[PDB]
Amino acid sequence: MVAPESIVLRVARLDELEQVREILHRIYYPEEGITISYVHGKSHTLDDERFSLSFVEQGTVVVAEDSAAKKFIGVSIAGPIQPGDPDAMVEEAATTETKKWGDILKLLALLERTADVCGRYGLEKAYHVHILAVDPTYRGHSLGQRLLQFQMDLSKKLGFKAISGDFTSVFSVKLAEKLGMECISQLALGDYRDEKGEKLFEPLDVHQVIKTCVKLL
């Protein structure tokens, strides 16, 4: 229902912080398998949001915009990862505002440690897509692929040698593979236990497996 060249992909500017916040609220957090599988509340927290938004000033937040409608219709958030990150995430978890964000941090740390992208390929760091979300209303415009391809092209231009992500739905994994990413590690979300032996995520079968997938750039 929209002219296809009315769709613009670009880096979000710092001054657009609030519109990034808005798209994350509307189309990302309500559908993210990790977030919504959590057994003590499905909504996201402020410390989760603060993390996502910290990347806007770094210039690695990519938006899809309907320029006619002057509206964000897609978003992807990425950042560097490097050895040492998982331990630092666990440390932040001990002091963060919510138990939920602390619990998710520890999950993400496990995903990152297990994947070991930097170790596996001999890198000092890699580019990791934290978030990839598309407004369902704008299906049929290949937005997911375009957002991911944009992050690939961008990180390559910034001198990163690998891009990764944790792909938490069967669709997002298929997209990743389509663009040449190989899934090198995985985790059954239902089977994840923290260091207290507790089961903190209870997913629908659509979000049953999380695959970390990587592509050399």
Author numbering: 1 to 217
Study authors write:
In this report we identified that aaNAT5b is a SAT enzyme in the yellow fever mosquito Ae. aegypti. Although aaNAT5b recombinant protein displayed SAT activity to all tested substrates, spermine and agmatine are much better substrates than others. Although aaNAT5b shares only 8% sequence identity with human SAT, they have similar biochemical function, i.e. both acetylate spermine.
In an effort to investigate the structure-function relationship of mosquito SAT enzyme and the substrate selectivity, efforts were made to crystallize its native enzyme and to soak them with its substrates or substrate analogues to determine its complex structure. After extensive optimizations, X-ray diffraction data was collected from the crystal of aaNAT5b soaked with hydrazine. However, a disulphide bond between residue 183 and residue 213 was found in the structure and it links two β strands (β7 and β6). In addition, residues 1–5 were modeled in the new complex structure, whereas they were not modeled in the previously reported structure because of the poor electron density in the region. All the test molecules are docked in the active center. Spermine interacts with Asp166, Val129, His130, Ser52, Asp48, Tyr28, Glu32 and Thr168 by hydrongen bonding and Tyr29, Phe51, Ile34, Trp101, Leu108, Val129, Ile131, Leu132, Gly165, Phe167, and Ser172 with hydrophobic interactions. Agmatine, spermidine, histamine, hexamethylenediamine, and putrescine share similar binding residues with spimine, but the enzyme has less interacting residues with them. Human SAT forms a dimer and the mosquito SAT is a monomer; mosquito SAT has a disulphide bond, and human SAT does not; and the conformation around the substrate binding sites is different between mosquito (two helixes) and human (one β strand), which may explain the substrate specificity of the individual enzymes.
